[PDB]
């Protein structure tokens, strides 16, 4: 019996459209913000205005989702150990609400930061496959929804990018907001990294299950 490609929370069609539209408005607003335009050298590295919706053109097909454990059908480290957990089996097909507190952009990815409840954290993996940038931050800090990737970037980069942003925030390197968008304060973390801290958290409905590809 092989396992899914990955486990995670799959947004309902309505929630996925709502978050997808929010992400597009953020990308449009950010690309027009004077502070972002001034930093455009810290963002691209070759040779007017950059339309971030075109820049992050590899957008997830289907519904948006929040991965818990990438399994690659059993080939990833920790995959079989994760899937045999009681909580994974008990939650399979169950509905959850995911809290989105912030949207972010780097030169590689765009996504949404997810803040897991204590019940949802029980579904978060704990294994060797954990990357180093998750060290020093609370478990589950990687939890995100990918909104878009640059052409040569793989989607998994989005979670590594979020962790790197949260390492800045941990030490206060976000500083004061450089500005404001209609739905929250805008933070520049340097090196092409931007975070919109939402005035009001977004909530999305999602079903925990396995995706097979």
Curated annotation (Swiss-Prot):
Residues that coordinate or bind substrate: 67, 146
Annotated GO MF terms: 2',3'-cyclic-nucleotide 3'-phosphodiesterase activity; RNA binding
Annotated localization: Membrane; Melanosome
Enzyme class: hydrolase
EC number: 3.1.4.37
Assigned keywords, A-Z: Hydrolase, Lipoprotein, Membrane, Methylation, Phosphoprotein, Prenylation, RNA-binding
Superkingdom as given in the UniProt entry: Eukaryota
One example of a Gene Ontology biological process annotation: cyclic nucleotide catabolic process
Modified residues (Phosphoserine): 45, 54, 173
Reaction catalysed by this enzyme: a nucleoside 2',3'-cyclic phosphate + H2O = a nucleoside 2'-phosphate + H(+)
Membrane topology, record value: Lipid-anchor
Residues annotated as catalytic: 65, 144
Secretion signal, residue range per the UniProt entry: none
GO cellular component, one term: myelin sheath
Described purpose of this protein according to its UniProt entry: Catalyzes the formation of 2'-nucleotide products from 2',3'-cyclic substrates. May participate in RNA metabolism in the myelinating cell, CNP is the third most abundant protein in central nervous system myelin.
Protein family (similarity comment): Belongs to the 2H phosphoesterase superfamily. CNPase family.
Subunit note: Exists as monomers and homodimers.
Name of the protein in its database record: 2',3'-cyclic-nucleotide 3'-phosphodiesterase
Species in which this protein is naturally found: Mus musculus (Mouse)
Lineage: Eukaryota, Metazoa, Chordata, Craniata, Vertebrata
This protein's encoding gene: Cnp
């Amino acid at each position: 019996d092989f396992l899914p490609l990955y486990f995670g929370w799959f947004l309902t069609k309505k929630s996925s459209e709502t978050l997808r539209k929010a992400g597009q408005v953020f990308l449009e607003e950010l690309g027009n913000h004077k502070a972002f335009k001034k930093e455009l050298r810290h963002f691209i590295s070759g040779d007017e205005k950059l339309e971030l919706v075109s820049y992050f053109g590899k957008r997830p097909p289907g519904v948006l989702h929040c991965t818990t454990k990438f399994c690659d059908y059993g080939k990833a480290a920790g995959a079989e150990e994760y899937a045999q957990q009681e909580v994974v089996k008990r939650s399979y097909g169950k509905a959850f609400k995911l809290s989105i507190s912030a949207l972010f952009v780097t030169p590689k990815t765009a996504g949404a930061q997810v803040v897991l409840t204590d019940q949802e954290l029980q579904l978060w993996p704990s294994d060797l496959d954990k990357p180093s940038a998750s060290e020093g931050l609370p478990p589950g800090s990687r939890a995100h929804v990918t909104l878009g990737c640059a052409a040569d970037i793989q989607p998994v980069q989005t979670g590594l990018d979020l962790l790197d942003i949260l390492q800045q925030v941990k030490g206060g390197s976000q500083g004061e907001a450089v500005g404001e968008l209609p739905r929250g304060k805008l933070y520049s973390l340097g090196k092409g990294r931007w975070m919109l801290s939402l005035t009001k958290k977004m909530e999305v409905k999602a079903i925990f299950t396995g995706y097979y590809g």
